[PDB]
Amino acid sequence: ANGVKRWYQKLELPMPPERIFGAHMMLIGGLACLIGTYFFASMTMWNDGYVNLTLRPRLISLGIYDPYDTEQIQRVWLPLIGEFSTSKLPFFGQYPLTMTDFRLFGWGCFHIGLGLWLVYAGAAHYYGARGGATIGEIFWLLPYVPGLKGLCQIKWFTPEGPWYKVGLPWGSFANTPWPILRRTYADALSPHTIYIGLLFFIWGFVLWFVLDKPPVPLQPAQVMTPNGLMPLEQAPFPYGWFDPYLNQVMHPMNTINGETTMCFVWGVLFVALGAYWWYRPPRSINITHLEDTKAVFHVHLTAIGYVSFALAIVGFLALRNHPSYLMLNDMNVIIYGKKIVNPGRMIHNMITFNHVQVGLLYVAAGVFHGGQYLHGLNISGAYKQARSKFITWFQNPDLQTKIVGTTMFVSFVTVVFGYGMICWNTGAELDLNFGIYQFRSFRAIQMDGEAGNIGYRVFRPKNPWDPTAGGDWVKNPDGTAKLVKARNLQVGDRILNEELGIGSSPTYSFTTIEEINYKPEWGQPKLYAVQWGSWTHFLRKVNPLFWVDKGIWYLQNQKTFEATRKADEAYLAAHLKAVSLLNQIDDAQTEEAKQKAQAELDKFRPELEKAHANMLEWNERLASTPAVLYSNLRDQHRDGEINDAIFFWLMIGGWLFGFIPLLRIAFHNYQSPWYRDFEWRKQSPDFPCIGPVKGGTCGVSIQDQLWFCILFSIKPLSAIAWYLDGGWIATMMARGNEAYYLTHNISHTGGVFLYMWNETTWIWTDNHLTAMLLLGHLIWFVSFALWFKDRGSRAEGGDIQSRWVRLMGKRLGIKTLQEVRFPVSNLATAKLWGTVFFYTGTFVLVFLYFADGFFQNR
Amino acid sequence: VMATGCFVGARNASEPRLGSSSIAASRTAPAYLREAQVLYEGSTDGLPKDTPADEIAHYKAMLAELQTRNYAACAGCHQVNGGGNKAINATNFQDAGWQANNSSPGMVTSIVNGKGKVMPAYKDKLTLQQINYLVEYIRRFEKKR
Amino acid sequence: MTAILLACLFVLGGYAALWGIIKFVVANTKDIAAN
Amino acid sequence: MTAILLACLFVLGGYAALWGIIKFVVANTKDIAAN
Amino acid sequence: GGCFVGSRDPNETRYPKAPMPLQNQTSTLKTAAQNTPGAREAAALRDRVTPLNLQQVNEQDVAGNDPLGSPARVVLDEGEMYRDPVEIYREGRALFQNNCVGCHGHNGCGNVPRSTNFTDPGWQENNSDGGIYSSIYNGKGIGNGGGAMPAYYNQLSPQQIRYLVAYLRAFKGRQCNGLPTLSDVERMVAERQ
Amino acid sequence: MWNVVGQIISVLCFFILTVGTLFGIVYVSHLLSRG
Amino acid sequence: MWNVVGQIISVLCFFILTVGTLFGIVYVSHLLSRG
Amino acid sequence: DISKVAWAWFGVLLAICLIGAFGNYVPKLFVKMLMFLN
Numbered sequence A: 001a002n003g004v005k006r007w008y009q010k011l012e013l014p015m016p017p018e019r020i021f022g023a024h025m026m027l028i029g030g031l032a033c034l035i036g037t038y039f040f041a042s043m044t045m046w047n048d049g050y051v052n053l054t055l056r057p058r059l060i061s062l063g064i065y066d067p068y069d070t071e072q073i074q075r076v077w078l079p080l081i082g083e084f085s086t087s088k089l090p091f092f093g094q095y096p097l098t099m100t101d102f103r104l105f106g107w108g109c110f111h112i113g114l115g116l117w118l119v120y121a122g123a124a125h126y127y128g129a130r131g132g133a134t135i136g137e138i139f140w141l142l143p144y145v146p147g148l149k150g151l152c153q154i155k156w157f158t159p160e161g162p163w164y165k166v167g168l169p170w171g172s173f174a175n176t177p178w179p180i181l182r183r184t185y186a187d188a189l190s191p192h193t194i195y196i197g198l199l200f201f202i203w204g205f206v207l208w209f210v211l212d213k214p215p216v217p218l219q220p221a222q223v224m225t226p227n228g229l230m231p232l233e234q235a236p237f238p239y240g241w242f243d244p245y246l247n248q249v250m251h252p253m254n255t256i257n258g259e260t261t262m263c264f265v266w267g268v269l270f271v272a273l274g275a276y277w278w279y280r281p282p283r284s285i286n287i288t289h290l291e292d293t294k295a296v297f298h299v300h301l302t303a304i305g306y307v308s309f310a311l312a313i314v315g316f317l318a319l320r321n322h323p324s325y326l327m328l329n330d331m332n333v334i335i336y337g338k339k340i341v342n343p344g345r346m347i348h349n350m351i352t353f354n355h356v357q358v359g360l361l362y363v364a365a366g367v368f369h370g371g372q373y374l375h376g377l378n379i380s381g382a383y384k385q386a387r388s389k390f391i392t393w394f395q396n397p398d399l400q401t402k403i404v405g406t407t408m409f410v411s412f413v414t415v416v417f418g419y420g421m422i423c424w425n426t427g428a429e430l431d432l433n434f435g436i437y438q439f440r441s442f443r444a445i446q447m448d449g450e451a452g453n454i455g456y457r458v459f460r461p462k463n464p465w466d467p468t469a470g471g472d473w474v475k476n477p478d479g480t481a482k483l484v485k486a487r488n489l490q491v492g493d494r495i496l497n498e499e500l501g502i503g504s505s506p507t508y509s510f511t512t513i514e515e516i517n518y519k520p521e522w523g524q525p526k527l528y529a530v531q532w533g534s535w536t537h538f539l540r541k542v543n544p545l546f547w548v549d550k551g552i553w554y555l556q557n558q559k560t561f562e563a564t565r566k567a568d569e570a571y572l573a574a575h576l577k578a579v580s581l582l583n584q585i586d587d588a589q590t591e592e593a594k595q596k597a598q599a600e601l602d603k604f605r606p607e608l609e610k611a612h613a614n615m616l617e618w619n620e621r622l623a624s625t626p627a628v629l630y631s632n633l634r635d636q637h638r639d640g641e642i643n644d645a646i647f648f649w650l651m652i653g654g655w656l657f658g659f660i661p662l663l664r665i666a667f668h669n670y671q672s673p674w675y676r677d678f679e680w681r682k683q684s685p686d687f688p689c690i691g692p693v694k695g696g697t698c699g700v701s702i703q704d705q706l707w708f709c710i711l712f713s714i715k716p717l718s719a720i721a722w723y724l725d726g727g728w729i730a731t732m733m734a735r736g737n738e739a740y741y742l743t744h745n746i747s748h749t750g751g752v753f754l755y756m757w758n759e760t761t762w763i764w765t766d767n768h769l770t771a772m773l774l775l776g777h778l779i780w781f782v783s784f785a786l787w788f789k790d791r792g793s794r795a796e797g798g799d800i801q802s803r804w805v806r807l808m809g810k811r812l813g814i815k816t817l818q819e820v821r822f823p824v825s826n827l828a829t830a831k832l833w834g835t836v837f838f839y840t841g842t843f844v845l846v847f848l849y850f851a852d853g854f855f856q857n858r
Numbered sequence B: 001v002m003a004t005g006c007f008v009g010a011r012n013a014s015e016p017r018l019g020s021s022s023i024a025a026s027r028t029a030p031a032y033l034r035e036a037q038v039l040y041e042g043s044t045d046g047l048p049k050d051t052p053a054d055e056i057a058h059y060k061a062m063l064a065e066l067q068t069r070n071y072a073a074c075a076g077c078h079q080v081n082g083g084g085n086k087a088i089n090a091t092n093f094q095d096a097g098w099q100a101n102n103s104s105p106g107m108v109t110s111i112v113n114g115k116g117k118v119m120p121a122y123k124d125k126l127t128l129q130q131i132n133y134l135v136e137y138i139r140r141f142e143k144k145r
Numbered sequence C, D: 001m002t003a004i005l006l007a008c009l010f011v012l013g014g015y016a017a018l019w020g021i022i023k024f025v026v027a028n029t030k031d032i033a034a035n
Numbered sequence E: 001g002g003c004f005v006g007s008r009d010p011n012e013t014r015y016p017k018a019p020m021p022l023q024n025q026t027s028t029l030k031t032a033a034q035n036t037p038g039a040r041e042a043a044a045l046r047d048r049v050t051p052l053n054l055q056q057v058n059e060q061d062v063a064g065n066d067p068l069g070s071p072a073r074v075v076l077d078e079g080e081m082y083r084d085p086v087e088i089y090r091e092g093r094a095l096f097q098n099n100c101v102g103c104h105g106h107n108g109c110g111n112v113p114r115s116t117n118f119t120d121p122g123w124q125e126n127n128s129d130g131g132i133y134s135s136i137y138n139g140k141g142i143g144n145g146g147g148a149m150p151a152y153y154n155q156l157s158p159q160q161i162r163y164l165v166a167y168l169r170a171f172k173g174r175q176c177n178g179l180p181t182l183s184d185v186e187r188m189v190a191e192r193q
Numbered sequence F, G: 001m002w003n004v005v006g007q008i009i010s011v012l013c014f015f016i017l018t019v020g021t022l023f024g025i026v027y028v029s030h031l032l033s034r035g
Numbered sequence H: 001d002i003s004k005v006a007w008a009w010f011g012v013l014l015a016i017c018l019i020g021a022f023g024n025y026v027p028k029l030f031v032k033m034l035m036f037l038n
């Protein structure tokens, strides 16, 4: 509490309102100037990059960015404009410009104009509260720009100034004698929600009359398109409601018109809720400590975190298949010279994971900040006499250990289940022998087709149920190995691994057929013989989301489901009967019998072709029905996978793993039960320890629990990233086209570890992304310097280094070096910067898994 | 603040035709594929009778220049429609197995470098942006199965 | 819409389920101090 | 034999080199304590 | 981990092959068992199973350093290339299992995103042998050292790439359980390579 | 469905072996420092 | 001969800029934290 | 020191270890009890 600690804590709560208000208004104005520049960065003369690409789908949907507009403009407004001083537009003049460049420049300028003015008006409230300020204090870096000192004594934002430099003439909100103004923060909740309702109404008027998207049901009967004037329902997506990439009319609320009708809906709701609160503001005793801005800061901030998580979820679904993003896949997208696989989905993934990441940070930081309010209360005596039940509901220390311990138990059980299943199935997929057990892989041999006429040597047991049976090789009467055709494989049969070409399982010798004539519920339309070893395909159904999704889809699609089932049925019967006819040919034994047989097969054949084409086309019609929750790349149903089931369990376990430190902040900011047995009392929110006593105590403060939340949460977050970008999370080594994935029509990019090496071969083909990869790795491992129990070693070595450098200064007569003292971070600041370095390392590196492309092929 | 925009540079495109942005054309599928079809066919003849006079003559000037550098058109090895020639081993772009087992990024370098014996290198004939357009046109030849 | 509603309902359901467990423990261990 | 002797001598000269350096620093900063 | 490895398969002899030549195959300097109880069975058995061109090859012998190793100049003589299935199998499975499985799978059906899948008939029909050489030699895609399909012109010899080319045509129309066997190579070679 | 009854037996033995072993190293690490 | 000299000059500048920058980070760390 | 109860777990872990190795190595070697063969 003397070093660097007073720099990132210089602006703490509570604060006066004019100071919060003006500072927010200035940030708003600054964020509008930055978006201004992003509009300039989106014009059509620039390369694709990750900024202008995250904005383009939305700019298309608004009609600002026209995808099919090539005509160059040469005059538009004021007379004669080939190019000027910076030219016809400042510096945009050497370029050829279209209408969408002008729209983009118009919107960019507005943003910059309205931003700059919001910055000024915000400084009028901010500096105006203080009576006013000087150009030299506002800007502060003008003292050392000699000359300009006569215009750095001028006072701005003053109370009685001439109009153009006034600030707040009555000094503060509370003194100004306007009765409309509300005097507390509860009271003010009402005009705030009226103001927000009005911002909605503004966006809908702009949508309707400036962007020309009327609200449903007042949509136009026709729209203008690059091919002329077209009925709304046939005009393609940016212009009308017809989705080209799915080839269907869009629901009316799936369009930007749907969005302008919701503008008016939401606006009316917010205005009415504000009118209600104008007569009935919040009042209960449970809430009146929230007038302190330090306390509401906790409520608001972790609320916004939850809002951010909810944006991620809603946005993901709503837009995973929307024509805004798919339209990027036809725009010849080139980044750092390259050509991207599926840039639509990539950009979509980046926006949703960016919201996800904001959600975690703000929830955690809101809780941390709340822990600071509560520690304050304890350390001044008034925690024990808080009156709101939102504090007092959790004061009993024994309830606090019951809450925490059962959320540890729930975390434990569900993480053990998830991770334990991942481990079981990587054992299965890798065919590992443990001596005590042999893991066995999925393997499939087609049994219909022409592949069902391929022969195999088969070792057949007689009676698996008599231990001490044994088996024999299937043979001819002549003694030589009979080749069994795949159609005649039976359950129990063993085939040599090396007759199948398998070199990856050298520890066991045979594949066992465990199921014949198998057709995947969801998968390829074929019939198979299977070794299910240890691979647990049933685990897909251990997912409550498998069942809700499939039940609702069955209900919407019941009678094509039913006909597809009857087609499969008729086909399996035809296959079986055709296999018996083929077998009578094989074993016919005398050409009279062999002609009779071949003539029977020749007569059944047309009918077996009919049943196959029937099954094929019902199974194709079934696989093109609309998705509910689990989706294709073309918004079609897919069954849930082992991957989806693992992701369900990992969300429960891993978010509880990551959030148990936050419950420790909320309950144990002053005393945990380990502290309370010793009589200890944590004296501040950020102390590093108090140890070596009792074995050592590093990491009990609230600041540290915040850092341990951030780390532990890296684990569910990376589950989310792998799952968005198409990794397979249910094992560690899944290969892209392994027999299981191929037979069950699953597309994935890798499998835990394998994903990592699989995506990085794509990452290596971009030299900007490989530079990012190198820098990312270096930031991270340096966090270890700062996080290991080693600060004393670093202090005592730094000291040797300082002595030495001062010896060199004194010897060589170099005055700048005879008093060097190297600065060595203390333990608290080492933990802060260690968490910073750990976090940023990891998440630059994750950006790369998204930036490489979306390789899921659906 | 940081990305004040983002300084990514200006986009490389093809040749300019007066009054119609070439940079823009290079991201608008119907414009880029019209130029890909011209390169692919070696003529402006299969272009929509709706094509403007200026367009039809800019393409011809493009071809005439390429004819002096001994450029060989893609059609007629591969045909006007795909799926080349088994005789010459010329690739069939209509085939779905050929299409699934190629990425568009990968396809690029096989046109740049040429491919084994007969398919010629185009690195000294065409710009990398004109190869990108052709990879996009070849994509639209795919048939099912 | 159906997918968005299902996903949100499942997140709030995980919270509600945790509340119910954590309150089946509190209600039936009320005679025992944790320690 | 030649490569073996070279490697070995290069490691032994790595240590001998360092000592010499250190000896130069000690002698030429005699009478400056390093506090 | 150690000692309790299994019994060795009697069909994999350890009987020794002749040593790899010191002279470069591209040299312009001077160009390019007994009767003891079981020594003849062991030599005959080594002649089918133990590979001769598995080892990385002298640096002057790599295809980028070989005067006749460029895609434009290599000789793809079909009679020499599809002459002997034992040999294609002996050599190409060792080279493939080592170098190519990582990215193309243990079944050779594709592991790394967008990777080839050699069992696909449509892919087989539309590739030449010379085409397959070009993509091994050059790599596929833009990047340093080839793209996502890496280049091999330092790394492999022209003779090693040719065993790879012939082996890869045994993948045609097989199922997704490991690699082509000796009789896959033989049915491929009978149906004209 | 005998593969799903067989598979499940294995998976259940895996969980007893592993979680039994984990809480076996936690019980033997308490005898080496306190009991 | 001349390429080599040109390359030595770029490498020197890089060492002057990266080591130089690193020490400035230390000095700045020093001014914040204390003196 | 070891409790009776912790000695009776260490017995269940060994029964699961030789029910696994007995069914893994017996059909490999004795060519019987074919149900468990691979």
Ligand code: 2GO
Binding pocket: A415, A418, A419, A422, A650, A653, A654, A657, A714, A715, A716, A718, A719, A722, A729, A752, A756, A757, A760, A773, A776, A777, A780, A781, A841, A842, A843, A844, A845, A846, A847, A848, A849
């Ligand atoms: C060919 C691959 C290539 C090479 C060059 C490479 C090598 C190495 C080395 C080395 C010497 O070999 C190191 C030391 C190293 C280090 C790292 N790399 Zn690294 N690395 C590569 C590539 C990359 C890339 C692109 C990325 C990393 C990422 C990272 C990161 C990871 C930091 C970290 O702690 O991350 C924790 C999260 C992990 C490991 C991901 C787990 C994902 C999984 C799907 C989650 C769910 C499943 C589990 C069983 C879950 C538990 C259950 C529950 C609690 C949720 C650091 C800098 C990083 C990352 O994983 O971040 C989460 C990252 O994004 N790396 N990495």
Ligand code: BCL
Binding pocket: A294, A295, A296, A298, A299, A302, A303, A306, A307, A309, A310, A367, A370, A371, A373, A374, A388, A390, A391, A394, A662, A663, A666, C008, C011, C012, C015
């Ligand atoms: C919606 C209610 C608000 C909230 C409103 C208030 C108000 C008002 C008060 C507090 C107060 C407290 N809150 Mg709070 N607080 C919220 C969330 C949290 C969370 C959390 C993990 O999310 C924690 C750990 C805390 C903890 C705390 C303490 C710092 C403090 C008093 C102890 C305690 O109450 O234990 C809390 C323990 C928990 C176990 C609760 C966790 C569950 C929360 C309620 C909801 C999560 C679900 C969310 C809706 C899911 C989102 C949906 C999806 C996005 C689709 N709050 C949410 C955002 N909180 C009091 C205070 O004094 O601080 C200044 C106080 O008066």
Ligand code: CLA
Binding pocket: A781, A782, A784, A785, A786, A788, A790, A793, A794, A795, A796, A797, A798, G018, G019, G021, G022
């Ligand atoms: C990049 C990794 C890195 C570097 C360069 C260092 C550097 C050092 N460590 Mg730290 N350390 C690291 C990581 C690193 N460490 C990790 C991962 C851990 C966890 C185990 C630690 C734990 C740790 C302990 C406990 C201690 C140290 C100590 C030391 C110092 C040894 C004294 C000395 O040998 O002088 C020789 C100097 C060098 C050999 C390094 C030269 C500078 C390097 C090469 C490059 C600068 C690179 C940097 C990333 C550049 C960014 C610059 C910016 C402009 C881009 C030295 C300053 C000791 C010490 O005395 O404390 C001061 C010490 O006690 N290290």
Ligand SMILES: CNCCOP(=O)(O)O[C@H](COC(=O)CCCCCCCCCCCC(C)C)OC(=O)CCCCCCCCCCCC(C)C
Binding pocket: A309, A312, A313, A316, A317, A320, A352, A356, A629, A630, A631, A632, A647, A648, A651, A652, A655, A656, A659, A720, A723, A724, A725, A726, A856, C007, C010, C011, C012, C013, C014, C015, C018
């Ligand atoms: C490339 N192919 C992957 C995507 O394929 P597709 O779109 O077909 O299928 C899914 C499935 O649906 C879900 O996956 C819904 C969540 C279920 C909750 C399951 C139950 C959740 C309960 C957890 C409660 C935790 C509490 C108690 C701490 O695609 C998605 O929706 C995933 C994208 C969304 C991104 C994740 C959003 C954040 C995760 C939840 C945040 C939680 C926080 C508020 C803490």
Ligand SMILES: CNCCOP(=O)(O)O[C@H](COC(=O)CCCCCCCCCCCC(C)C)OC(=O)CCCCCCCCCCCC(C)C
Binding pocket: A002, A003, A004, A005, A778, A779, A780, A782, A823, A824, A825, A826, A829, G021, G022, G024, G025, G026, G028, G029, G030, G032, G033, G034
């Ligand atoms: C009284 N002593 C103890 C109590 O006080 P106490 O510990 O807070 O004092 C610290 C400690 O010392 C360090 O913490 C070491 C830094 C030097 C290592 C030097 C090594 C740094 C290199 C690391 C880079 C690796 C990354 C890139 C992977 O307080 C701080 O340094 C606080 C951190 C603030 C630093 C701000 C950096 C911004 C400067 C950027 C612009 C400078 C130049 C560009 C002009």
Ligand SMILES: CC(C)CCCCCCCCCCCC(=O)OC[C@@H](OC(=O)CCCCCCCCCCCC(C)C)OP(=O)(O)OCCN
Binding pocket: D001, D002, D003
């Ligand atoms: C695995 C490990 C544990 C085992 C270590 C192996 C040890 C092997 C010992 C290495 C033996 C080398 C001799 C062979 C050789 O040097 O060859 C001929 C060499 O003739 C000699 O000088 C002969 C004199 C050799 C008398 C030296 C005895 C060595 C002592 C070992 C001490 C080990 C310690 C204590 C660490 O030729 P030239 O250099 O002239 O020509 C270049 C060759 N192109």
Ligand code: HEC
Binding pocket: B040, B072, B073, B074, B075, B076, B077, B078, B088, B089, B090, B091, B102, B107, B110, B111, B115, B116, B117, B118, B119, B120, B122, B134, B138, E126, E127, E128, E129, E130, E131, E132
């Ligand atoms: C003279 C014939 C000829 C001309 C002209 C020709 N090609 Fe080819 N091309 C071939 C043959 C032959 C192959 C088969 C390559 C091989 O051996 O595998 C092929 C292969 C291809 C492939 C498949 C490559 C791959 O990787 O798999 C593409 C794409 C292709 N050509 C595009 C073009 C384009 C684009 C042009 C014109 C710009 C063009 N070709 C001109 C003959 C030609």
Ligand code: HEC
Binding pocket: A761, B101, B102, B103, B104, B105, B106, B107, B110, E099, E100, E102, E103, E104, E112, E113, E114, E115, E116, E127, E132, E135, E136, E140, E141, E148, E149, E150, E152, E164
């Ligand atoms: C690093 C991963 C990787 C390794 C190692 C690798 N490949 Fe590939 N391979 C790919 C990818 C990715 C493709 C798809 C390229 C494309 O279209 O984008 C591919 C494609 C191919 C193609 C088809 C080329 C064509 O033009 O159609 C052949 C042939 C090929 N690989 C053979 C091999 C052989 C032989 C080896 C070992 C020598 C090998 N590969 C090693 C990743 C790899």
Ligand code: SF4
Binding pocket: A688, A689, A690, A691, A692, A696, A697, A698, A699, A789, A790, A827
């Ligand atoms: S090593 Fe550090 S954290 Fe641990 S007791 Fe000592 S000073 Fe505290």
Ligand SMILES: [Ca+2]
Binding pocket: A725, A759, A849, A850, A851, A852, A853, A854, A855
């Ligand atoms: Ca990706």
